[PDB]
Amino acid sequence: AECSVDIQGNDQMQFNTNAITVDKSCKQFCVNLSHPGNLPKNVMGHNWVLSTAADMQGVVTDGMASGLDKDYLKPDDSRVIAHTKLIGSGEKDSVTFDVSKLKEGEQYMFFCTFPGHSALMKGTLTLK
Ligand SMILES: [Cu+2]
């Protein structure tokens, strides 16, 4: 619970938190994403996708283009630090990543890459 967070994406196209802080002393960090609400993945899909603020736009744009079967993520996208898969209602998914992939003083953003969603479905992550 020191090195992990629980996040929900619902049918209102929103995350239930908008800022995550990763403690420097964590060796690894975990995000658990769940999808309450009742809409299917093809219509209201949420992933939890992490990049630098600088790369967010590019990741969203290219993810948009890659289609549903690719979880709206460009395959092998180098800008994606960590991601869950794309989930629909009733589903849940985890991602654990090495905290050493982060550095102090850089601004990270987490976002959903289902088309259109990142407008509302974004938040900050920073390494303290
Ligand atoms: Cu979404």
UniProtKB/Swiss-Prot annotation:
In terms of PROSITE patterns, this protein maps to: COPPER_BLUE
UniProt domain Plastocyanin-like: residue ranges = 1-128
Cellular compartments annotated = Periplasm
Among PANTHER family, the record links this protein to:
AURACYANIN-B, OUTER MEMBRANE PROTEIN H.8
Please list the disulfide bridges: C3-C26
Recall the GO molecular function terms of this protein's record.
Answer: copper ion binding; electron transfer activity; identical protein binding; transition metal ion binding; zinc ion binding
Question: Known SUPFAM superfamilies for this protein?
Answer: Cupredoxins
Presence of the UniProt keyword Signal in the record:
yes
What InterPro entries does the database record attribute to this sequence?
Answer: Azurin (IPR014068), BlueCu_1 (IPR000923), BlueCu_1_BS (IPR028871), Cu-binding_ET (IPR050845), Cupredoxin (IPR008972)
Q: Which domain of life is it from?
A: Bacteria
Q: Note the Pfam families from the entry.
A: Copper-bind
What is this protein called in UniProt? Azurin
Q: What is its main location?
A: periplasm
Arranged from A to Z, the UniProt key words for this protein are:
Copper, Disulfide bond, Electron transport, Metal-binding, Periplasm, Signal, Transport
GO cellular component: a single term: plasma membrane
Binding-site residues for Cu cation, renumbered to this chain: H46, C112, H117, M121
What's this protein's function? Transfers electrons from cytochrome c551 to cytochrome oxidase.
The encoding gene is azu
Q: Which residues form a coiled coil?
A: none
